[PDB]
Amino acid sequence: GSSGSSGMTVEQNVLQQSAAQKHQQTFLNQLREITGINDAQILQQALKDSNGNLELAVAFLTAKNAKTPPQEETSGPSSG
Numbered sequence: 001g002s003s004g005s006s007g008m009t010v011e012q013n014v015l016q017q018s019a020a021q022k023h024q025q026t027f028l029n030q031l032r033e034i035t036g037i038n039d040a041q042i043l044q045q046a047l048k049d050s051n052g053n054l055e056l057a058v059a060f061l062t063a064k065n066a067k068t069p070p071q072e073e074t075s076g077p078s079s080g
């Protein structure tokens with residue numbers, strides 16, 4: 001079981017590393033915010049291509065759905 005062993009230690013995190021990296025769900029969710037995409041058919045597609053590389057999943061996504069250039073048209077900018 002779990003039990004009340006150990007008192008606040010950093011011995012139950014170092015594991016997360018990698019172990020987490022290997023999690024499709026975690027990936028999609030990752031590319032979900034990164035690119036902000038929601039569709040899974042798009043998130044997965046990126047992953048599939050990347051072959052398991054977020055950077056590639058983002059690059060592929062980024063090199064597909066980006067903001068339009070400073071052309072003559074409406075849009076509506078934003079700032080703080």
